[PDB]
RNA sequence: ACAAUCUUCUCACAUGAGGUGUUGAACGAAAAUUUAAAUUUAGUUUGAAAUCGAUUGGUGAAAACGGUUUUACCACUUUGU
């Protein structure tokens, strides 16, 4: 924690630039890992990043306000870019919006059409060309939508063995890696 | 019982002797003493429990054991020595003020003119002192 | 009961009946939990190479040998534990040795119970350690009898200066009238 | 002569002198300032180029080159400064053998000064510690991020030509001059050309800052050389 | 059963014990080494052992094993 | 997990400006400051050493009912985007 006041202080104040890796209208960013007693910041800009839980999956849309936030907690979570193909298997596997509240999947584009019926989104396609050409529904379906949980896949022997791993995530900005990570999260 | 716990690995606080010396029983007091003018751990900490037969088996456990590289000495003294301000401000979070920030914020610190008046009032008396001090 | 489990619990408690001398009375009182997870967290860096990787890098040293290359002229004296009784005990009689590991069930007893003995008259701090199969791991083996650093790096002797001196005042310090007097008859 | 509107040096500078021969059976100038003119404790010295030289030759230095040291290592030798720079220790090798407080205290006394390069002049607050970093050692901001005998030496020069000025949250300036055996008009001229470089890149508002200058030695009273004598209508500006 | 009689080990001896001087062969490379490799380094002159890239990339190759050769020579209401 | 993010330069320009970061304790100098108090503050010492000696200004973040208790580097850019 000690560590973690340090990073977070070097990195506020005569810090206040962030790299941004560009073209790219959204970005992935996933917290592989947790702090035991996190700082009251950290907690609540992971209630703001929507990742309060680990090993959660959601696309956030890049920008320079999100950049602040993907500076805030990439020492407790890793970023990258999200690819095309990726993605259009990624709603489709693990579309589980907040129905009513509840994390419900999007099996049937009839409920797709009635709650994104008022953002013009009647079918999964036509919301994911909403989401990968982000419009301005996409900001109101990632509301509707409960975030994904990637949660890592024990495999092999070792998998089951090793203390405390989890298939080897790494920190930072994956990139084509985070599209690597989503290719094996299902 | 108190005890005296000394040659702790740097930056441990009460919070974290507190959160390990109740799964051994009651913690009553705790002193983790500090510099005056700077408020960093003297690295030399103090802590009173409920009963002396607890803090005795306590101390049997914590006779020269090492963590994080240091053997940690832990042996509940008798209370004869034991005085009032043993555990004078336990339980209670130090304030490290800045007083060089106050003394930055003094030292530039906007006034009036009888309050800049003040500051150069003895600007001659200690230069007619230098001047005799020849 | 099996024709030999009512041998296996009677040799339990035949040690623990009868009348120990004091030099064997030494080996039941034993290094701790805690201090004994230290030292091997020291010795896990100076395992002996395994002798499958020990020859992965001879093909990588005999490879450039081959075509004119060397490393011999830049090579720097390897460092590990020091293993095998007759190495150790002739690593205490020329005291190039520092810290001396003795494995508290080795079969016959008399294969180190001269050891305890030597480490305190020529001055190499000495503990008395559980299981010599947890030495066996140390070393890549089924089961050893002793270890013994004789010299780590200057990465660590600073560490070694200090768990030796955890060595010495809870088992030297310690232990000081159980190795004095006559051990079992419970 | 643009310190208070006046050139007190080298008279005062020949009686110190005197005074010090006076008061016979190293220099330090004490400032007073119009505030607290650091904003904090800077950990890192200020290289005040001095024409007469209060750093000791006969001093060996050791340089904390960073990774791989094998380089500038040979470098060393090839500078030919073997007699000046003692002994080059590794970036890594320095965060990574001598780690102890008490054997950061003997590598510290183990070597007489210290060189250190400014690539890596940053990392130097942690892996040292205030067992050097408090001590009255403080590291010296060496420029050899080139890698070359000139680039070397002329630093190397320039670590033993000028001197070093550590800033920290203060309203008090103090400056060590040099030694006594040095000339007074030598040392009257280096204390000129440090206030040359006071002006420049330590006070904030120059001269004009700089209240009372008072001279002393390292046990010897303060005689004020310089002392601003509208510091009264000044102090009313700033403190309103 | 009386006490512990360390009347000898009592005491620590200051200095080693055996005098034979310190050889040689423990400030140098080991020669065993240096006689190891040279059979290896003559076994690739010869061509029985795979070299240390030949360890890795003959195993990449491998393991592509999907039917490389031939075997054979109620409905919606 | 006793693993962990303290700065092996940056930015401009070619000269600059930066690079915030250091056990404890004991020891002890003479000067300057700053606002009587504080600040800087020689030289020391020593095992990451220790057996009462705590100083007490200011900023607000959550529970709680405007008080109240909880932070164990919250410091003046002042404790939960």
């Known amino acids: 924690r000690e560590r973690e006041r340090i990073r977070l202080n070097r990195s506020a104040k005569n810090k206040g630039d962030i790299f941004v890796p560009d073209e790219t209208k959204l970005l992935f960013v996933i917290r592989i890992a947790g702090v035991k007693n996190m700082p009251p910041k950290i907690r609540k800009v992971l209630r703001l990043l929507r990742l309060s839980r680990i090993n959660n999956a959601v696309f956030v849309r890049n920008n320079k306000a999100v950049a602040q936030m993907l500076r805030i907690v990439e020492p407790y979570v890793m970023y990258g870019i999200p690819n095309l193909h990726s993605v259009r298997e990624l709603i489709y596997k693990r579309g589980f919006g907040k129905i009513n509240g509840q994390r419900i999947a999007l099996s049937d584009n009839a409920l797709i059409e009635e709650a994104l019926g008022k953002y013009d989104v009647i079918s999964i396609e036509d919301i994911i060309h909403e989401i990968y050409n982000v419009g301005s529904h996409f900001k109101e379906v990632t509301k509707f939508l409960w975030p994904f949980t990637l949660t890592p896949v024990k495999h092999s022997l070792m998998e089951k063995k090793v203390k405390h791993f989890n298939e080897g995530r790494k920190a930072g900005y994956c990139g084509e890696e985070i599209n690597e990570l989503i290719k094996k999260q299902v | ?134 | 009961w099996p024709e030999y489990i009512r041998l296996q619990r009677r040799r339990k408690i035949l040690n623990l009946r009868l009348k120990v001398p004091p030099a064997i009375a030494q080996f039941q009182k034993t290094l701790d939990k805690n201090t004994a997870t230290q030292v091997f967290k020291l010795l896990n860096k100076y395992r002996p190479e395994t002798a499958a990787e020990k020859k992965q890098r001879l093909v990588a040293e005999a490879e450039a040998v081959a075509n004119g290359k060397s490393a011999q002229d830049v090579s720097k004296k390897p460092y590990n534990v020091k293993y095998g009784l007759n190495h150790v005990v002739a690593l205490i009689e020329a005291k190039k040795a520092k810290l001396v590991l003795i494995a508290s069930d080795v079969d016959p007893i008399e294969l180190v119970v001269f050891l305890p003995a030597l480490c305190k008259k020529m001055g190499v701090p000495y503990a008395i350690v559980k299981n010599k199969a947890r030495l066996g791991t140390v070393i890549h083996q089924k089961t050893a009898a002793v270890l013994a650093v004789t010299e780590v790096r200057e990465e660590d002797k600073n560490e070694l200066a200090s768990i030796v001196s955890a060595v010495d005042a809870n088992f030297s310090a310690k232990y000081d009238e159980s190795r004095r007097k006559w051990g079992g008859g419970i | 002569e643009l310190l208070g509107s006046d050139a007190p040096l080298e008279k005062v500078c020949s009686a110190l002198l005197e005074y010090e021969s006076k008061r016979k059976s190293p220099v330090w100038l004490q400032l007073a300032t119009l505030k607290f003119i650091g904003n904090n404790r800077k950990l890192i010295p200020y290289k005040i180029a001095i024409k007469n030289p209060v750093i000791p030759s006969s001093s060996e230095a050791c340089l904390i080159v960073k990774d791989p040291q094998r380089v500038y290592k040979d470098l060393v030798n090839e500078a030919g400064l073997s007699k000046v720079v003692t002994r080059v220790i590794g970036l890594s090798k320095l965060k990574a053998k001598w780690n102890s407080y008490e054997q950061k205290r003997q590598l510290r006394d183990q070597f007489d000064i210290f060189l250190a390069d400014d690539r890596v002049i940053p990392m130097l607050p942690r892996i040292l510690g205030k067992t050097f970093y408090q001590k009255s050692k403080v590291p010296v901001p060496v420029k050899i991020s080139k890698g070359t005998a000139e680039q070397l030496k002329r630093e190397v020069v320039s670590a033993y030509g000028a001197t070093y000025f550590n800033s920290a949250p203060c309203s008090s300036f103090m400056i060590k001059c040099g030694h006594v055996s040095n000339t007074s008009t030598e040392l009257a001229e280096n204390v000129e050309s440090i206030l040359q470089f006071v002006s420049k890149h330590i006070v904030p508002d120059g001269a004009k800052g700089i209240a009372s200058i008072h001279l002393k030695t390292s046990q010897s009273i303060a005689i004020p050389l310089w002392n601003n004598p509208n510091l009264k209508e000044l102090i009313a500006s700033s403190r309103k | 059963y009386p006490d512990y009689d360390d009347f000898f080990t009592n005491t620590v001896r200051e200095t080693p014990l055996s005098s034979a001087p310190e050889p040689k062969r423990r400030f140098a490379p080991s020669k065993h080494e240096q006689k190891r490799i040279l059979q290896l380094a003559y076994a690739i002159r010869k061509g029985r052992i795979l070299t240390s890239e030949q360890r890795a990339e003959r195993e990449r190759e491998s393991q592509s094993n999907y039917a490389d050769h031939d075997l054979w020579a109620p409905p919606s209401h």
């Not at chain 2, 705790?30 to 408020?39: C, E, I, P, W, Y």
């Not at chain 2, 409920?50 to 042996?75: F, I, P, R």
């Not at chain 2, 920030?101 to 530039?108: D, K, M």
């Open chain 2, 1 to 134: 019982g108190v005890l005296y716990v000394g040659r702790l690995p740097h930056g441990f606080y009460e919070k974290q002797m507190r959160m390990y010396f109740s799964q051994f029983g009651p913690v009553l007091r705790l002193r983790m003493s500090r510099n005056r003018k700077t408020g960093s751990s003297k690295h030399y900490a103090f802590i009173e429990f409920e009963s002396l037969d607890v803090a005795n088996v306590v101390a049997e456990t914590m006779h020269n054991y090492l963590l994080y590289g240091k053997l940690l000495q832990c042996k509940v003294i008798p209370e004869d020595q034991v005085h009032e301000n043993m555990f004078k401000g336990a339980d209670v979070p130090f304030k490290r003020i800045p007083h060089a920030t106050i003394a930055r914020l003094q030292h530039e610190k906007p006034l009036s003119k009888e309050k800049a008046d003040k500051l150069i009032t003895r600007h001659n008396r200690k230069l007619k002192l230098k001047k005799r001090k020849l």
